[PDB]
């Protein structure tokens, strides 16, 4: 029994060891899905970092290798491939403020954010959102304020709270608040510390992941 | 109508296919697999003399 086959078991042990170390190499990395609207500005929040359906972005920040997937250049049915992305760590969800009042794209960004937040594959994964074009939003409200495309709004017709209202109106779209945490940053053309916010939120998710693994949760 | 006339030509090519009614074309599905009950190792479980598992 097993005369010549022992060489094959030696091969099937060595390449299994290679599979094990490759899985450990892919486990200490961390992937982030990156959705976004059409002409939103998600290419800026892969330009602020250091850095065909999916195109990767494999970069690093303090020994924590991020893998972005700006998938949105793929026109197909999202339902039959989004199940590949369960178990992703965070989900960056870029929303413009320069496509703020064009055919009102902000409401269809709400539709997409509700379709990805209440999606049954993403009921646990946190969803970071970068509200881009702050540096143009703050002077497209001082001239044409937000009470035009929002009926139930009044008060702060400046940048000051009228962006906090958009933040609250996005954060009031999760039906399940005690499971997932929705982060929010305001990116900029300068002050390249967005990857610090990504690192902070992904660290805050690795804490919850290791608490789920260790049994505390 | 560059795609709608493609649908017209597709259903016009597909309309003249010779049907056969299903007493003559599903009883053959029973007469086939009635003459292949011997060569099927999931109908009746084959013992380990011929099973390589």
């Amino acid at each position: 029994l097993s005369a010549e086959d022992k060489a094959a078991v030696e091969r099937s042990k060595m390449i299994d060891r290679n599979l094990r170390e490759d899985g450990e190499k892919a486990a200490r990395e961390v992937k982030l899905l990156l959705l976004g609207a059409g002409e939103s500005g998600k290419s800026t929040i892969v330009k602020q970092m250091k850095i065909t359906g999916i195109v990767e972005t494999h970069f690093t920040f303090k020994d924590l290798h991020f893998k972005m997937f700006d998938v949105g250049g793929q026109r197909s049915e999202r339902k039959k491939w989004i199940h590949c992305f369960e178990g992703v760590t965070a989900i960056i969800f870029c929303v413009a403020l320069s496509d703020y009042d064009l055919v009102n794209r902000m409401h269809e960004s709400m539709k997409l954010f509700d379709s990805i937040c209440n999606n049954k594959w993403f009921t646990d994964t946190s969803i970071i959102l970068f509200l881009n074009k702050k540096d143009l939003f703050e002077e497209k409200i001082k001239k044409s304020p937000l009470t035009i495309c929002y009926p139930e709004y009044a008060g702060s017709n400046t940048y000051e709270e009228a962006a906090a209202y958009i933040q609250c109106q996005f954060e009031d779209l999760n039906k399940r608040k005690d499971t997932k945490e929705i982060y929010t940053h305001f990116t900029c053309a300068t002050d390249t510390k967005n990857v610090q916010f990504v690192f902070d939120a992904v660290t805050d998710v690795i804490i919850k992941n290791n608490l789920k693994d260790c049994g505390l949760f | 109508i560059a795609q709608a006339r493609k649908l017209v030509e597709q259903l016009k090519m597909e309309a003249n296919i010779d049907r056969i009614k299903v007493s003559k074309a599903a009883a053959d599905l029973m007469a086939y697999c009635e003459a292949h009950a011997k060569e099927d190792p999931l109908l009746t479980p084959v013992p380990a003399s011929e099973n390589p598992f």
Partner: protein, 281 residues
């Protein structure tokens, strides 16, 4: 009087309950988790190291009623070695699990590099070997020196005669109660002080009581560690300074002292494998 046969039931009830619990835990690990992640390796380690010491418990029971060690020399060295081996293993598994949870919470970036299921088994073999490296100097001097009439089971020393065994009690105290308490109260307190500054657990009342649940579990494990292994070390230190007057109310409390020394081994099933979410699946 009639306490010498009645104490054995309530002293081996710890054996029965802890053996049933630890066999339940090692069975559910070997039959429902398959040792795939890092945490179940440590849980199976603590369950095995508690199970063997819990099965040891009837052997100390005969040393009150029978008076002797009526097992011959063919078991004294072996039982002393596995007792002083599985005690340090049940301590060091708790220490390594505490360091694992501290790395998993307080240092989240490096925890992806460290606590792979290969390194968890490696540090498991490491602390079994380090427990052997101090249990074998217990084992080689685990002699059998007869009394007025009995067979006994005790540890004489090398030269010098009465001091080189007196090092062993102080070493088990400062290396088996001072160091594990001093590591698992800080190693968990900095974890709690980190989890209070986590946005996942800070606000949001249901998640606030989840944070409360985590802190209750950590206070329960640390408090049951201190409450179990306070008297069996405090008494063995006080038995070295003063020769206690042989009051007949002492020795029932001293076998109870051994019993709550092993209550930690008994209750680690109820402490870990019941009070998690891995039992539900």
């Amino acid at each position: 009087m009639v306490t010498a046969i009645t104490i054995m039931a309530l002293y081996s009830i710890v054996c029965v309950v802890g053996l049933f619990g630890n066999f339940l835990v090692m069975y559910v690990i070997v039959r429902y988790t398959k040792m795939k992640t890092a945490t179940n390796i440590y849980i199976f380690n603590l369950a095995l190291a508690d199970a063997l010491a819990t099965s040891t418990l009837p052997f100390q029971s005969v040393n009150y009623l029978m008076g002797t060690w009526p097992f011959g020399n063919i078991l004294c060295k072996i039982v002393i070695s596995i007792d002083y081996y599985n005690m340090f293993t049940s301590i060091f598994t708790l220490c390594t699990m505490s360091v694992d949870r501290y790395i998993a919470v307080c240092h989240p970036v490096k925890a992806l590099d460290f606590r792979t299921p290969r390194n968890a088994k490696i540090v498991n073999v490491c602390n079994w070997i380090l427990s052997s490296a101090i249990g074998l100097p217990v084992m080689f001097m685990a002699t059998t020196k007869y009394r007025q009439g009995s067979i006994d089971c005790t540890l004489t020393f090398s030269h010098p005669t009465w001091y080189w065994e007196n090092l062993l009690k102080i070493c088990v105290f400062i290396f088996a109660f001072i160091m594990p308490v001093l590591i698992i109260t800080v190693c968990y307190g900095l974890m709690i002080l980190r989890l209070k500054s986590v946005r996942m657990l800070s606000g949001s009342k249901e998640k606030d009581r989840n944070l409360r649940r985590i802190t209750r579990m950590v206070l329960v494990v640390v408090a049951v560690f201190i409450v179990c292994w306070t008297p069996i070390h405090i008494y063995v230190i006080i038995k070295a300074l003063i020769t206690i007057p042989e009051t007949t109310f002492q020795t029932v409390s001293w076998h109870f002292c051994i019993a709550l020394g092993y209550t930690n081994s008994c209750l680690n099933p109820v402490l870990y494998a019941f009070l998690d979410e891995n039992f539900k699946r």
